[PDB]
């Protein structure tokens, strides 16, 4: 709800994470500092959302939907997706977690709704998702030309 905001880069307390829960960079040895600039439509960017997530009977994989996606998008095996999701613990208490998942396969090109098979196990029953990151994919896709 505002348009007057600042971006502050403090070289003390550099915590690497989506939710600032991770290793801290050592400020005493840095080679370059490059800002990551992308567009809104970069790789199913703006309007994606997780919807459902659940385990599979297989040893390895688990299933994940991806929600609203612009038509000109595709996923190849090996792409990585990050999200902040909430689950129900075994004891019955809600928790929050962040993770990075690989992909093995998917279905539904061009229909704007994907169902992706991903590697790994899930710690509990799904509740909701608060943030989703679907950037840096392998396969190319055309978009309407924009100058900014």
């Amino acid at each position: 709800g505002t348009k007057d905001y600042i971006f502050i880069l403090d070289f003390a307390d550099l915590r690497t994470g989506v939710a600032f829960n991770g290793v801290t960079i050592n400020p005493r040895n840095i080679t370059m500092i490059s800002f990551d600039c992308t567009e809104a439509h970069h790789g199913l960017g703006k309007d994606a959302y997780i919807a459902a997530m659940y385990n599979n009977d297989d040893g390895a994989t688990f299933q994940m939907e991806i929600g609203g996606i612009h038509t000109n998008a595709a996923l190849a095996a090996g792409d990585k997706l990050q999200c902040i999701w909430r689950y129900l613990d075994v004891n019955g208490n809600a928790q929050a977690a962040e993770n990075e998942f690989e992909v093995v396969s998917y279905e539904g090109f061009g229909t704007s709704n994907f169902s992706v098979k991903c590697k790994g196990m899930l710690p509990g029953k799904f509740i909701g998702c608060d943030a989703f990151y679907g950037k840096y994919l392998q396969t190319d896709g055309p978009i309407k030309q924009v100058d900014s």
């Binding site: 829960n21 991770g22 290793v23 801290t24």
Partner: protein, 149 residues
Amino acid sequence: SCGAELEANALLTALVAGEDFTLPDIDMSGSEYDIPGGINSPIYAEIEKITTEQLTTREVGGSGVFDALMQSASNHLLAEFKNNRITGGDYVKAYIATMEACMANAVQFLTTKDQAYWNAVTAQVAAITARANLGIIKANFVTAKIQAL
């Protein structure tokens, strides 16, 4: 009911009037009372056993304390040698001369460095616990005054 609670409140308000007892207002969840890093701090990393291969790897290349101590001295001497200030013989003689002090210092650096670090995390933990103990002391002051009365 007859409002025994109202009588108790009024009596307590009237009996202890004339003095001020204000409790401390420290909030102990403000991230100033937590150890800096989470699970990803170097405190929670696994400690590896010290072996001979961490002292010297029997190669001129490196990856050891003695090897690095020799290579740095060789680099400095070669830096002076590339300028037409010495010849090969002087460089070789100085290298051979330092070859033993390098070993003597390398044997000590490992043992001292494995302790110089672990003597500091304990100081961190002590200071962070001492903040909370100071808060408890501030809380005990008021109980001391009430004991006087």
